[PDB]
Design a protein around this nucleic acid. Structure first.
Ligand SMILES: C[S@@+](CC[C@H](N)C(=O)[O-])C[C@H]1O[C@@H](n2cnc3c(N)ncnc32)[C@H](O)[C@@H]1O
Ligand SMILES: C[S@@+](CC[C@H](N)C(=O)[O-])C[C@H]1O[C@@H](n2cnc3c(N)ncnc32)[C@H](O)[C@@H]1O
Lengths: 371, 223, 120, 371, 223, 120
RNA sequence: GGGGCGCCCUCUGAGCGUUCGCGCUGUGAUGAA
RNA sequence: GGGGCGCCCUCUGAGCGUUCGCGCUGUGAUGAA
């Protein structure tokens, strides 16, 4: 009765000599646990799922994929051997999309790879989590830049609107979106360069297209020449650049935020968590701030007894969607869980976002059901 | 501007107003990519510019790679993922039904790979040493194509080791070798050719000059 | 536990518990991690009591390196359930701080001078 | 005694039948006069230099280049004929670089073509001067954008410095120039990518190169990876873009300023003249402002009884170089000539900058010589 | 990147990392040009990219123009100056010792020409109708090369008229004609060829396809 | 002169000069282009006097189109030297404005109603 | 019981839901911007 | 936080240099930020 042991994201699977499943213990869909056990598997510590599996089989001889485990499994009193690229281990991976559903780790293929994705990202951030230290300050500079870009866009768009109104005054009130405005100035310039089919290539409904081109002929503005167009375009294209840079920094923000303080990120999001660090100064200084201090990180409201008052944290979809009277009780619950999330990332600990979100969800649901 | 379908699946060519041709991939995730590569639209669909001088693979295609194993629904193990440029294009070629497991060593570069692998749900990034496939044996899956582009003197049998782990039978392998051009055929590359012939089958050896004036690619079938 | 800097004997552990109990009806104390941290920052704290069996450990791990900065001693207790009921509560507490000793002025002064020896 | 008449920028030249100079009257090096007489030459009115020339020869028969003149010269009582591409007129232009010096219009070749350049620009702006109206408002938007760019650069550079200090704190105080700072971040990134020869390729003296690279190794800052570099570079390259856009708008500004209000421009410069129009609202509103109002276009100092007080106009090199006591008397003189310059461009009149600058120069010299 | 001297004076070719060749002119005024054309340095000297698809002249050079009359110290009359792109390159070729008198009709475009002619002290811009050389007879000078690129049906004798005014004897003329390709030589272009042969001498007729799929250039010597 | 909108007879030209002279010792007037323009903008001006022989002409050409906007009539005088000495000055003036007519109240009211006829 | 100087002044610190069994809670109840 | 009246509407307005001949000046003297 020789058993080949397979350890994987899905769990621990015991095979016979011919690639038939003998027994399995499935890993739970917790990112925090699987990540930590995977780091242990590198040193040779088996999954808790393996210990349970070996208990419910107690085989004559076990043969493991990884040579670092051999001593650690012999310590339990099993006869252990080691094959590297065993014909069994391959057969397992040959049918990996399926066996994940077969051992009931996932319901279908999509959410398995959707889990494996969230994992592959987390796992490879844990090996980064003992970071080249200073990473939090960079995220602060990243989120401050985003605020500096948003503040810049408004300045340039206002100037671009006031400039372009000389050629086309009707356009200023037709589109309140600063981006779309700059896009029209970029690819066209002169009013009489606009067509019906040229405007659909940007995603516009027919009810506004017939408002623009009807205003194009009925323009009160004066004729303009290519000096002014090339000059206006400089700002117009820069607005379009900044609009890209902002969206691109946001993608960079997520990559830093999930690396330096992943537990804070899982609660509030990347942007809100970043903006919290900005007020504190560093990650360590957020951990030293108790639950009561986090809740009031507006600093202007408390010093009186800021814009969107009682806590900067209320941008959270559960304090924004829910009515005005529930807001006091939720803000505490979030700040309490934020306190833990800060300290747990300050030690550079594991991932507890999957439980903390479920702990907050239970308490938000217990506030909504009390009338 | 015009976009034309080429021999290889999910890979296109881009005719320009100035006449130049740059390789093209179907952008799997729209709106993004942002600052760096150039974004272009043609008849509704969004496409991404694939530079043949930065990508060794794109070099090989222009260099006349007869048969490309990477197509729609291909699962690949990419050893030497780096900053993500080249895999993002295989991400595009592979589409959502196929998968790209990427293994990169130096942290300084992986963090960039993460950002790329964030938005693309078919790329699975891994900080790991390719000399120890045991370290990711627990995460990855058996693949259809083995792409190996490592900065090592012993790439050839690092790939071979990885192959007998994850590469399917009858599968394919793209190796990158620091390889010079005359009128034999593959007598020049016998050192790395014969080392594979112990358990592999050589199909094409392609010298990347002048797209990459150092490296060459060996397409191989696993027995 | 890795956040425990020094080994604490059981005799001093129970003598710490009794020092807090006396201050609940003769002096003033603060109960809970949040308030305990607020006491050390302000400088009102005289002695900090930390539970050993807290999970996850990270919730109180900041206190020992905070109390060293503001020059205030701190002691560990073996149980959180034994610290919770001692503080006149029905639930467990992770950390407690003393501001006014009350009837435990001589009991605290003995504790602070016994922990300084096992530190160095 | 048949004379071939040549009219040109240099003046009026009388030739014989074989291309020999008989007599000449040289045009004065005034842009305002030559431009206006050139517009008259299209209608057929001769140069005043021609009238003088014909007086001092009174020929038997004159033959002119342009057929529009024939009647206008016959009105004086001369026998006039018309050859289009006469062998004489060509011979004149064959030796045009030389005859300009020969008739003493210019001292050498360089300043002749330097004059012809200033002219060709002015002449072809006069034909534009009866304009497509609204041009002044565009210049206002152009100079306001330059102020909006300068205000933006400071915001991004400050953020870029604070961000990059994480990798290199020593660099922040080493170069106070915002541009040079962003250039280093753009082409390099990591500190250890800097060489001695790489820094000279930007124009640096050896005394600062050995300060930078000595600070590169002695850096207190933490190690950074290519996420942060690619992110920092986004801002760094945008700063470099804006630095170009500003310099490019300034070139556009000159082209508009010399077209819409050339007389104001000749006095103060393109930038100062533009900034004056910004406060007024339009060109017409500057003409309606009397000499006393122009002098006090700071608006904050007068309302008390702004930054660089007694007149915004003092940025003029003659009020800035000269000591504190002369400033009151010069500010009046400039504002008085600015008043004229505004009204003369509001009518869309000629060029009088060459006399106005000489009128101001005489009065500035009469203030400096009174102790 | 590399810059190599070509047959024609003050005109260079630019080797790139991607292999493409773009025509090159010696930037007479450094620091500027700014936003639009690409700026490049090679061994101290700054060069400007000359696109062959925007410039009809640059088309003709790549199309194999045997002898270019525009060189160092050339004085030109440029009829059809437009937005200044193409003259800026002749400004570069001509250098400071030669001169470029540019005549453009529509104001909408001249204002752009001004900005170009501002920084370059060898370009002398003129808002004028090319049908009336009397209007600028008073400003310009006798030139060495007549470049004519007007959007008119009667260009051929508009240029001829201008030529007998300003073009030196033994001088040259570049005409632009809305001209189609077979195996005669110039029998196809006889309408405009013979019209010149009354007082000009034909040297080369060059069809600009595919750089400009409409126009063709006729290089001519004036007797 | 091209900035002269209407032909002015010599009789009304001298009757305008006399109307300003009377206001120099019985009312209040403003002398010079700068002050004259300041009078029309504020609305204090009743009548504006413009010299015909000003060079360059452009210095006063803004007044006629400014005075039409604020509904204040204006008259031309044939000489600037004759307007300068009339205003009690030793130099010539380009334009003058009247705020308080004084002893020339009936003389101004005759002028304003004689110029409105030659306008339309 | 009444006033001038410096200091810690960076929410409060024990309750609430309940079917009266018991539940959620100092790892933050409740009261505020 | 909302509207009807007057006011400063955003310098002053006639002098200064001089060899005592006369010069620079309302197309802005002089006095101020
Ligand atoms: C030449 S680069 C590949 C470039 C890639 N095709 C691109 O452009 O995106 C090779 C990479 O392999 C990585 N590498 C080096 N040793 C490795 C190892 N032992 N295991 C995995 N990757 C390694 C290096 O970090 C290096 O960046
Ligand atoms: C085809 S464009 C020349 C393009 C030019 N080579 C460039 O790329 O910079 C011809 C120009 O001649 C101009 N033009 C038309 N009629 C003209 C005329 N009568 N006299 C002078 N120029 C004229 C037009 O404004 C038009 O822009």
């Amino acid at each position: 009765v020789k058993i080949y042991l397979i350890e994987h994201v899905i769990g621990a699977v015991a095979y016979d000599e011919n690639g038939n499943i003998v027994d399995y213990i499935t890993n739970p869909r917790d990112l925090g646990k699987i990540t930590e056990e995977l780091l242990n598997n590198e040193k040779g510590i088996p999954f808790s799922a393996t210990v349970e599996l070996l208990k419910k089989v107690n085989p004559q001889e076990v043969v493991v994929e990884n040579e670092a485990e051999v001593p650690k499994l012999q310590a339990l009193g099993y006869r252990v051997s080691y094959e590297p690229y065993s014909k069994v281990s391959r057969i397992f991976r040959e049918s990996l999309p399926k066996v994940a559903i077969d051992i009931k780790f996932a319901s279908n293929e999509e959410d398995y790879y959707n889990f494996l994705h969230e994992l592959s990202l987390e796992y490879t951030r844990r090996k980064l989590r003992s970071a080249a230290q200073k990473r939090d300050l960079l995220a602060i500079q990243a989120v401050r830049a985003m605020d500096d870009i948003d503040k810049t866009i408004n300045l340039f768009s206002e100037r671009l609107r006031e400039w372009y109104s000389i050629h086309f005054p009707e356009l200023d009130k037709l589109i309140e979106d600063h981006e779309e405005y700059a896009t029209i100035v970029s690819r066209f310039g002169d009013r009489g360069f606009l067509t019906i089919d040229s405007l659909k290539e940007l995603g516009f409904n027919e009810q506004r297209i017939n408002r623009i081109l009807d205003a194009a002929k009925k323009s009160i503005g004066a004729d303009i020449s290519e000096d002014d167009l090339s000059a206006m375009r400089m700002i117009a294209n820069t607005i379009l650049d900044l609009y890209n840079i902002r969206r691109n920094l946001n993608n960079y923000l997520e990559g830093v935020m999930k690396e330096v303080a992943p537990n804070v990120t899982a609660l509030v999001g990347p942007a809100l968590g970043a903006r919290l660090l900005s007020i504190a100064g560093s990650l360590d200084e957020l951990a030293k701030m108790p639950a009561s201090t986090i809740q009031v990180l507006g600093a202007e409201k408390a010093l009186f007894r800021r814009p969107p008052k009682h806590g900067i944290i209320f941008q959270y979809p559960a304090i924004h969607t829910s009515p005005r009277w529930q807001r006091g009780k939720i803000a505490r619950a979030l700040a309490a869980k934020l306190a833990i999330a800060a300290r747990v990332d300050a030690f550079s600990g594991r991932f507890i976002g999957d439980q903390l979100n479920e702990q907050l969800k239970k308490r938000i649901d217990e506030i909504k059901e009390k009338f | 501007i015009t976009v034309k379908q080429t021999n290889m699946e999910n890979i296109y060519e881009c005719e320009f107003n100035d006449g130049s041709f740059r390789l093209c991939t179907r952008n799997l995730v729209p709106n993004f990519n942002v600052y760096g590569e150039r974004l272009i639209k043609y008849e509704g669909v969004e496409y991404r510019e694939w530079n043949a001088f930065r990508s060794k693979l794109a070099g090989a295609i222009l260099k006349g790679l007869k048969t490309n194993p990477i197509r729609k629904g291909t699962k690949v193990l990419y050893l030497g993922a780096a900053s993500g440029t080249t895999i993002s294009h295989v991400s595009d070629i592979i589409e959502l039904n196929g998968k790209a497991y990427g293994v990169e060593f130096s942290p300084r570069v992986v963090r960039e790979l993460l950002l790329v692998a964030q938005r693309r749900p078919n790329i699975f990034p891994l900080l790991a040493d390719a000399r120890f496939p045991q370290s990711y044996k627990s995460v990855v899956e058996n693949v259809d194509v083995l792409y190996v582009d490592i900065a090592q003197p012993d790439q050839t049998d690092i790939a071979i080791y990885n192959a007998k782990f994850f590469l399917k039978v009858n599968g394919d392998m793209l190796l990158v070798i620091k390889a010079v051009t005359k009128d034999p055929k593959e007598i020049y590359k016998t050192e790395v050719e014969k080392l594979e012939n112990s358990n592999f089958e050589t199909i094409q050896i392609i010298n990347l000059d002048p797209y990459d004036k150092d490296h060459a690619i060996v397409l191989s079938k696993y027995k | 536990a890795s956040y425990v800097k020094f080994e604490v004997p059981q005799d001093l552990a129970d003598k710490v518990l009794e020092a807090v109990r006396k201050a609940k009806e003769s002096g003033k104390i603060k109960k809970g991690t949040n308030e305990t941290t607020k006491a050390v920052e302000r400088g009102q704290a005289k002695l900090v009591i930390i539970a050993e069996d807290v999970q996850p450990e990270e919730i109180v791990a900041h206190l020992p390196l905070l109390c060293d900065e503001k020059k205030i001693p701190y002691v560990y207790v073996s149980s959180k359930k034994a610290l919770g009921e001692a503080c006149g509560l029905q639930v467990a507490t992770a950390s407690a701080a003393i501001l006014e000793p009350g009837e435990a002025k001589d009991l605290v002064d003995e504790i602070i001078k016994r922990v300084n020896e096992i530190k160095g």
